[PDB]
Design a binder for this molecule. Structure first.
Ligand code: NA
Length: 129
C-alpha cells in the first residue's frame, strides 16, 4: 500500500505513535517518507546481507525474522513479511521497541540525516488529526 501523507499520519496516531518516546507525529511521517516513500512493500538489501522491510525500513539484523540473515535476532518476534502489510500495526509495534532501544530515532539513519532538527511539523500541516 502507498499511503498518502495525512492518511499515514492518521494511521500512526491511531496506533499511538504520536509523541511516542517524545517524538511528535511529524518525526514519524518524515522518517517514513525518506525510508519507504510511504510504501508498505518497500524492501532494501544491506551490504551485510540483512534486509530492511516496510514503511519504516525495519532491519532483519535485530528486529524481524527473514530466515536469510545469519547470526541475526528477531526482537519484535515477527516474520519480516508482516512489516510489508497494508495494515501498519506490526511496523508500529516494532518501531516502538526500536525507538525505546536507547538512541531514539537515530536508529533510522535517514531520520538523523534528513528529518532531525528540520521543520518536521510540515509533514502533518493541513491534516485532519
Ligand atoms: Na533476524
Amino acid at each position: 500500500k502507498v499511503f498518502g501523507r495525512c492518511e499515514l499520519a492518521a494511521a500512526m496516531k491511531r496506533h499511538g505513535l504520536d509523541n511516542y518516546r517524545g517524538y511528535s507525529l511529524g518525526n514519524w511521517v518524515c522518517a517514513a517518507k525518506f525510508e519507504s516513500n510511504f510504501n508498505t512493500q518497500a524492501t532494501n538489501r544491506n551490504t551485510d546481507g540483512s534486509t530492511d522491510y516496510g514503511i519504516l525500513q525495519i532491519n532483519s539484523r535485530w528486529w524481524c525474522n527473514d530466515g536469510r540473515t545469519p547470526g541475526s535476532r528477531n526482537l519484535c518476534n515477527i516474520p519480516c513479511s508482516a512489516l510489508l502489510s497494508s495494515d501498519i500495526t506490526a511496523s508500529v509495534n516494532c518501531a516502538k521497541k526500536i525507538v525505546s532501544d536507547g538512541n531514539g530515532m537515530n536508529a533510522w539513519v535517514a531520520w538523523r540525516n534528513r528529518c532531525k532538527g528540520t521543520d518536521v511539523q510540515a509533514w502533518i500541516r493541513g491534516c485532519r488529526l
